[PDB]
Design a protein around this motif. Structure first.
Motif, PDB file in Angstrom:
ATOM      1  N   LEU A  17       0.828  -1.205   0.000  1.00  0.00           N
ATOM      2  CA  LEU A  17       0.000   0.000   0.000  1.00  0.00           C
ATOM      3  C   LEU A  17       0.868   1.263   0.000  1.00  0.00           C
ATOM      4  O   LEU A  17       0.573   2.228  -0.707  1.00  0.00           O
ATOM      5  N   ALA A  18       1.945   1.255   0.782  1.00  0.00           N
ATOM      6  CA  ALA A  18       2.882   2.382   0.803  1.00  0.00           C
ATOM      7  C   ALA A  18       3.467   2.609  -0.585  1.00  0.00           C
ATOM      8  O   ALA A  18       3.602   3.751  -1.045  1.00  0.00           O
ATOM      9  N   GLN A  19       3.816   1.518  -1.257  1.00  0.00           N
ATOM     10  CA  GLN A  19       4.330   1.617  -2.620  1.00  0.00           C
ATOM     11  C   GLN A  19       3.306   2.260  -3.545  1.00  0.00           C
ATOM     12  O   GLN A  19       3.634   3.170  -4.311  1.00  0.00           O
ATOM     13  N   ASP A  24       8.291   7.126  -0.252  1.00  0.00           N
ATOM     14  CA  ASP A  24       9.705   6.899  -0.547  1.00  0.00           C
ATOM     15  C   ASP A  24      10.176   5.626   0.151  1.00  0.00           C
ATOM     16  O   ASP A  24      10.578   5.648   1.322  1.00  0.00           O
ATOM     17  N   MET A  25      10.145   4.514  -0.575  1.00  0.00           N
ATOM     18  CA  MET A  25      10.376   3.215   0.041  1.00  0.00           C
ATOM     19  C   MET A  25      11.805   3.054   0.541  1.00  0.00           C
ATOM     20  O   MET A  25      12.062   2.294   1.483  1.00  0.00           O
ATOM     21  N   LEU A  28      12.025   3.609   4.301  1.00  0.00           N
ATOM     22  CA  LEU A  28      11.609   2.487   5.126  1.00  0.00           C
ATOM     23  C   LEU A  28      12.671   1.392   5.086  1.00  0.00           C
ATOM     24  O   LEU A  28      12.999   0.789   6.113  1.00  0.00           O
ATOM     25  N   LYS A  29      13.214   1.141   3.898  1.00  0.00           N
ATOM     26  CA  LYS A  29      14.250   0.124   3.743  1.00  0.00           C
ATOM     27  C   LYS A  29      15.480   0.442   4.599  1.00  0.00           C
ATOM     28  O   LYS A  29      16.052  -0.460   5.218  1.00  0.00           O
ATOM     29  N   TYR A  30      15.864   1.714   4.664  1.00  0.00           N
ATOM     30  CA  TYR A  30      17.046   2.082   5.439  1.00  0.00           C
ATOM     31  C   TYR A  30      16.845   1.774   6.921  1.00  0.00           C
ATOM     32  O   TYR A  30      17.716   1.197   7.577  1.00  0.00           O
ATOM     33  N   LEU A  31      15.676   2.138   7.434  1.00  0.00           N
ATOM     34  CA  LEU A  31      15.326   1.857   8.817  1.00  0.00           C
ATOM     35  C   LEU A  31      15.295   0.357   9.086  1.00  0.00           C
ATOM     36  O   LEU A  31      15.846  -0.120  10.083  1.00  0.00           O
TER      37      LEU A  31
END
Length: 91
Positions: A17-19, A24-25, A28-31
């Motif tokens: 849903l975020a995508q 800005d995915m 989230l990926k960095y976290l």
């Protein structure tokens, strides 16, 4: 004892849903990578903190002011639980 990595079924739906909503995915990926790599404690910008009520046992990090990651972290597991707006996750 080796800590695992887990993703709830709901988490996968939340990520899709975020995508779809053009978040800005990479943020989230960095976290997620910091958590997976045990590069902890997280830096202050995430405002990381434990949760109570229905989310007791979980933690809340802010990817953005209205984009939250709810996850659980123990010695045994890292579980990505939900991600989305504060309203969606808590309301």
């Amino acid at each position: 004892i080796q800590r695992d990595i887990e993703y709830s079924g709901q988490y996968s739906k939340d990520v899709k849903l975020a995508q779809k909503r053009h978040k800005d995915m990479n943020k989230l990926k960095y976290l997620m990578t910091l958590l997976i790599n045990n590069t902890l404690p997280l830096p202050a910008v995430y405002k990381d903190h434990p949760l109570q009520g229905s989310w007791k046992g979980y933690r809340d990090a802010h990817v953005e002011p209205d984009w939250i990651l709810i996850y659980k972290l123990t010695d045994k597991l890292l579980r990505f639980e939900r991600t989305g707006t504060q309203a969606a996750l808590f309301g």
